[PDB]
Design a protein around this ligand. Structure first.
Ligand SMILES: Oc1c(Br)cc(/C=C/c2ccccc2)cc1Br
Ligand SMILES: Oc1c(Br)cc(/C=C/c2ccccc2)cc1Br
Lengths: 115, 115, 115, 115
């Protein structure tokens, strides 16, 4: 029920091997690690979680954009791109979080579907 | 070798039933109709052309954003979103043209791959 | 002046300076006629394109010479240019800012319309 | 002042007015400490956050209260807020504008860094 897709606006290509960390806000208001992975050759990251595991909550998807641009030898502006949202509060949904990256800019969007 | 994908930033959903017209610049510098179609329930439009047909040239992909927002009962700013590019000039490539729409804004990106 | 164009560079994190911009108005025969042009300043802005008297209701196209901009920086871009096509409407607010954010394979644009 | 934040609304084509913005600086213990805050003006801009003397090199986070903005307009948004996290570096240019373009399910941000 959670997928992340990352594109590179400079190359005109998927952003491959981008690290992604997902957190969920805990009872005590701290960010607990939830899941993590790397985008594939398609710029997609699948398999982060299951419908059982992905309960209601406030989630933070951290896309490690600085590490991505540095691995490419470029000095970018942002430390990371974060997307913070409440999920599954009217029941289970499927979420795609897409991000389009440039060295000094990013854009993100969500696609939310009801299975 | 040509796909168009359109997302809606207001709904958080694919932009469905968006009309798309493709033109190719002719010998005489006019825009000749090349192909057209509508996005599906996934916001994707497949099947516009073939690798034989999609020769080198300058192409214009016109995404009919006004008609999309009007069909939804909304008065938007732009008449359409255009993406104009040279294609296949170093041999055949696969192109995805993605666009993310709001009533007073759009963003577009290209993903170009070599099969 | 009721129309201003602002262009930014997402790669360098700067105003896009000395970008040619041409504005056209749609004529009764559906051709585009030249209306105004200039080059962006050091702030990435192009002021003084027109006056209230001249800027009547109608369909306008703002063409931004993105290809020359990228080539002058030694970067190969995807698009031939960026175009923004819209209707000016006297029942809306009176001042239009057309803003564009440029990357080699992507651009984003928005309108800020105010009184 | 070396730091300005500008927020725009992609749905209405306007400045995003009276949006709360909080700036934090990363402390030696890795916690975020409050640094500056304010509300955007009628132009969507927040000036006067800090001074040159106070704005030393370091990691800063700009948090934008997008959720309250959309709810005040009667719109259900996706994100809890928008955050922009970056390093201020004295070897780069001296003035930082953080610009954000808001839609209910999307946002785009860019940095314009100039001398
Ligand atoms: O499967 C795709 C593809 Br192909 C492109 C996108 C493009 C997303 C995007 C475009 C402009 C600004 C922000 C995100 C999203 C998804 Br989902
Ligand atoms: O005066 C400005 C500044 Br400074 C930045 C912008 C940024 C616009 C923008 C940001 C993200 C995507 C598309 C456009 C617009 C204006 Br009018």
């Amino acid at each position: 029920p959670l997928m992340v897709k990352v594109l590179d606006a400079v190359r005109g290509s998927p952003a491959i091997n981008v690290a992604v960390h997902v957190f969920r806000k805990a009872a005590d208001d701290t960010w607990e690690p939830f899941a993590s992975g790397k985008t594939s050759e398609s710029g997609e990251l699948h398999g982060l979680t299951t419908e059982e595991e992905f309960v209601e909550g406030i989630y933070k998807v951290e896309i490690d954009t600085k590490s991505y641009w540095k691995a490419l030898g470029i000095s970018p502006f942002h430390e990371h791109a974060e997307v913070v949202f409440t999920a599954n509060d009217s029941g289970p949904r499927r979420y795609t979080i897409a991000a389009l990256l440039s060295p000094y800019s990013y854009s993100t969007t969500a696609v939310v579907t009801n299975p």
